[PDB]
Ligand binder design. Sequence first.
Ligand SMILES: *[C@@H]1O[C@H](CO)[C@@H](O[C@@H]2O[C@H](CO)[C@@H](O[C@@H]3O[C@H](CO[C@H]4O[C@H](CO)[C@@H](O)[C@H](O)[C@@H]4O)[C@@H](O)[C@H](O[C@H]4O[C@H](CO)[C@@H](O)[C@H](O)[C@@H]4O)[C@@H]3O)[C@H](O)[C@H]2NC(C)=O)[C@H](O)[C@H]1NC(C)=O
Ligand code: HEM
Ligand SMILES: *[C@@H]1O[C@H](CO)[C@@H](O[C@@H]2O[C@H](CO)[C@@H](O)[C@H](O)[C@H]2NC(C)=O)[C@H](O)[C@H]1NC(C)=O
Ligand SMILES: *[C@@H]1O[C@H](CO)[C@@H](O[C@@H]2O[C@H](CO)[C@@H](O)[C@H](O)[C@H]2NC(C)=O)[C@H](O)[C@H]1NC(C)=O
Ligand SMILES: *[C@@H]1O[C@H](CO)[C@@H](O)[C@H](O)[C@H]1NC(C)=O
Ligand SMILES: *[C@@H]1O[C@H](CO)[C@@H](O)[C@H](O)[C@H]1NC(C)=O
Ligand SMILES: [Ca+2]
Ligand SMILES: [Cl-]
Ligand SMILES: [Cl-]
Ligand SMILES: [Cl-]
Ligand SMILES: [Cl-]
Ligand SMILES: [Cl-]
Length: 588
Amino acid sequence: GCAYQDVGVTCPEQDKYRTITGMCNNRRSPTLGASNRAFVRWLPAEYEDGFSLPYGWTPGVKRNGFPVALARAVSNEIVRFPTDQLTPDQERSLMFMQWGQLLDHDLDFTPEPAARASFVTGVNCETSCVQQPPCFPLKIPPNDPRIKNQADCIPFFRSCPACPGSNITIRNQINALTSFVDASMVYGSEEPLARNLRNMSNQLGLLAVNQRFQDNGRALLPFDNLHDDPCLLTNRSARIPCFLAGDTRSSEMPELTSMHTLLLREHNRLATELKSLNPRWDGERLYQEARKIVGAMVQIITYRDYLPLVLGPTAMRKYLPTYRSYNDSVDPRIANVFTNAFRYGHTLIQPFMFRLDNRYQPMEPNPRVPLSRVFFASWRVVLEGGIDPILRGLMATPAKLNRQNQIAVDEIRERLFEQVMRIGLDLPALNMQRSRDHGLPGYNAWRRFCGLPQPETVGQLGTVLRNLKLARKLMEQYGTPNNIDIWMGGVSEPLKRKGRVGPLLACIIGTQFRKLRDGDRFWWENEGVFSMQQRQALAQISLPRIICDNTGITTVSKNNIFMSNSYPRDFVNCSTLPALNLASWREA
Ligand SMILES: *[C@@H]1O[C@H](CO)[C@@H](O[C@@H]2O[C@H](CO)[C@@H](O[C@@H]3O[C@H](CO[C@H]4O[C@H](CO)[C@@H](O)[C@H](O)[C@@H]4O)[C@@H](O)[C@H](O[C@H]4O[C@H](CO)[C@@H](O)[C@H](O)[C@@H]4O)[C@@H]3O)[C@H](O)[C@H]2NC(C)=O)[C@H](O)[C@H]1NC(C)=O
Ligand code: HEM
Ligand SMILES: *[C@@H]1O[C@H](CO)[C@@H](O[C@@H]2O[C@H](CO)[C@@H](O)[C@H](O)[C@H]2NC(C)=O)[C@H](O)[C@H]1NC(C)=O
Ligand SMILES: *[C@@H]1O[C@H](CO)[C@@H](O[C@@H]2O[C@H](CO)[C@@H](O)[C@H](O)[C@H]2NC(C)=O)[C@H](O)[C@H]1NC(C)=O
Ligand SMILES: *[C@@H]1O[C@H](CO)[C@@H](O)[C@H](O)[C@H]1NC(C)=O
Ligand SMILES: *[C@@H]1O[C@H](CO)[C@@H](O)[C@H](O)[C@H]1NC(C)=O
Ligand SMILES: [Ca+2]
Ligand SMILES: [Cl-]
Ligand SMILES: [Cl-]
Ligand SMILES: [Cl-]
Ligand SMILES: [Cl-]
Ligand SMILES: [Cl-]
C-alpha cells in the first residue's frame, strides 16, 4: 500500500474490458481505483500522537480538550434500545438493507491481521485483552448490561497499515477491492482469485459452481478453503465451509450469500445466451461480455433504484446530478471516511432472517431465525431450502427504520458473531473504535467539510438533531460535538425527506458515488462502452427480473424493489416482466 508502487505502469493503447484489479481505468494515473492500495483521505488523519496511535489508546490523553468516550459506553447509552419496540419501515423492504451490504462489498474491504498471524506479533487479539499492537481491544464500562467483568473486553484488531515501516508518513489503511462499481464482489479484485472463480474446464465462459450441492437443480457458490473457517463453527455436525466468491464476506449472512448466488447464476445465464447468439465467441469473450453486463446491472440498480432511496430527492440533485461525461481528473478512490459512513446500513438490520415459501407464507418449521444464529451459517443455504425462501423474505418484509431512540438492534449490538467468537461483539461499538483506528476526524470536522453548521453547545446540537434529548445524551458521553465519532453522529441526524440518512451522511455518500461514476472510464453510459442499442436494452433490467430469471420464484416485487415490501399488494407474476433482450450483442 505504498503510493510509489506501480507508478510506472503503462496502459494498453486500446482495451475492451475492465481489468480485474482496476488498474488502467484511468490511463493517465493507472493506479487510481486499483485494488490493494491506500484509501484516499478527504481530511487529514487525526491520531493521538499525530502519526498512528488512535484516540483512546493512552490513558488520560484527551481529544479536542475532552476525555475519549469508551465506544462500548456510547453504544450502551445511545444505541441500545428494547427490541420489542422496533419500528418497521413502511416504505423500504429488507432488500434495501441487503443491497447496501452487497454494494459495500463491491467498494471496500479493509484488511486486518489474522489471528493465525499472531505468532508473528505476540498477542492474539481474539483471546487476550492486552492492548499491544495490532490489538486495540474495546474496554468494558461499569454497569454494562451484558459484560459484568470489567477485565474482559471486546476483541479488536487494528486495520493493516498502508506501507508499514515508513517512519515519515501518517498511518493510512488499505482497500483490498476495486473502488469502481464493477461487480468485483462477483469476479474478484485480484487476478489469481478471479481465475479460481472461473470454470476453466470448457470454453463456455462460466463462473465455477458448487460441486457437492445444488439448490433445487440450480447452482450454488463453490466452497472456499480457509484456515480457521468460521462457517464450520456454526453447525458443527454439518461442517459446511464458507463459500468462495469475489469478496471474502459472502457467507457472513445467508441473505448476502443469496445475493451473491443470484449474480453467479445471472453471469452463467448471460454467458449461455451469448454463446447461442455468437457461437464463435471463445470462453474468454463470453466471460468478459457477461461480466460487463453484470457490472452494468449493478450500476443501474445502484444509481437508478437504490441511491435515490438512500439520499432522498434534494440530496440526489445536489450530490448526484445527471451524468454528463467521464472525466479523468476525478479521483475514483474510496475515501477512508466512506468505509465508516456507509455503515449507516447497520441501522436497517432486523433481528431475524425470514424465510417465506412459494405462497409467500412463513416457511415451516422455522420461518424466522435470530440473526445471531445465521452469521457464517452457510449450512442454512445448503441444508434449509436454498436461496428462494430467503429472497422472498427480503422482498416481502420491511427494513428496520432508523429512529433516534432506536438506532441498532441487540442482535448486532450484543450478539454479533456469537457462535464463532469467544464473546458476542457489538457492531456499533466496533464502528466507533474503527473510526478511531483509522484516524477519522470527528463529527464537526465532517460537518465543516460538507458545508454544514458545526454545533458547539448542547442547545446547538439539539437544534441540528431536532432532538434535545439525544443531544444531551451525546454531550454527556462525548463532552463536545467535535468528538462525536462519525458513524454515531451521522446516524443520529434526522432523516432527509424520502431518504434514510441525514444531511451529513447524504453529503459523504453522495459525494463518494458521484466520484465513482464520473471517474469511471467504464461507466455503462460513457460513450463507446455500450452501443446505443445495448444501452436501451440495459435500461430494461431490474432486480425483480434477475430474480425471475435465476430462481424458482415466479411472483416478485413491483418496481422499486427497495420500496415495495408488502405482499400481495406490491407483487406481480414474473411473466409480466420482459427479460433483457441481448439481440444487439449479436456479431455477424
Ligand atoms: C463447468 O461447467 C460444466 C458445464 O456447465 C459443469 O458441468 C455440470 O456440472 C453440474 C453440477 O455438478 C452437473 O450436475 C449433476 O449431474 C449429475 C449427473 O450427471 C450426469 O448427467 C448430466 C446430464 O443431465 C451430464 O451432463 C453429466 O456429465 C452426468 O453424466 C446429477 O447426478 C447431479 O444431481 C445430483 O447432485 C446434486 C448436487 O450436485 C443434487 O442436488 C441432486 O439432488 C442429485 O443428487 C447434478 O445434477 C452437470 O451434469 C454438469 N454438466 C455437464 C454438461 O458437464 C461443471 O460442473 C462446471 N465446473 C465447475 C467447477 O463449475
Ligand atoms: C448481515 C448484515 C451485516 C453484518 C453481519 C455486518 C457486519 C460488519 C462487520 C463485522 C464489519 C466490520 C466491523 C469492524 O470494524 O471491526 C462491517 C463493516 C462494514 N459494513 Fe456492515 N454488516 C452488515 C450489513 C451492512 C450493511 C446493510 C451495510 C451498508 C448499507 C454495511 C456496510 C459496511 C461497510 C462499508 C463496512 C466497512 C467495510 C470495509 O472493510 O471497508 N454493512 N460490517
Ligand atoms: C445442523 O445441521 C443438521 C443437518 O441438517 C441438522 O439436522 C437435521 O435436523 C432436522 C430437524 O431436526 C432433521 O429433520 C434432520 O433429519 C437432521 N439431519 C441430520 C443429518 O441430523 C441440525 O439440526 C443442525 N444443528 C444445529 C445446531 O443447527
Ligand atoms: C474535467 O474536469 C476538470 C475539473 O473541473 C475540468 O477543468 C476545469 O474546467 C473549468 C472550465 O473550463 C475551469 O474553470 C477550471 O479551472 C478547470 N479546473 C481544473 C482543475 O483544471 C476539465 O475541463 C474537465 N474536462 C472536460 C473535458 O470537461
Ligand atoms: C524506521 O525506524 C526504525 C526504528 O528507528 C529503523 O530501524 C528503520 O530503519 C527506519 N526506516 C527507515 C526507512 O528509515
Ligand atoms: C404466471 O403467468 C403464466 C403465464 O400466463 C401462467 O401460466 C402462470 O400460471 C402464472 N403464475 C401465477 C403464480 O400467477
Ligand atoms: Ca469494485
Ligand atoms: Cl477520509
Ligand atoms: Cl497495528
Ligand atoms: Cl465446491
Ligand atoms: Cl429520543
Ligand atoms: Cl414464488
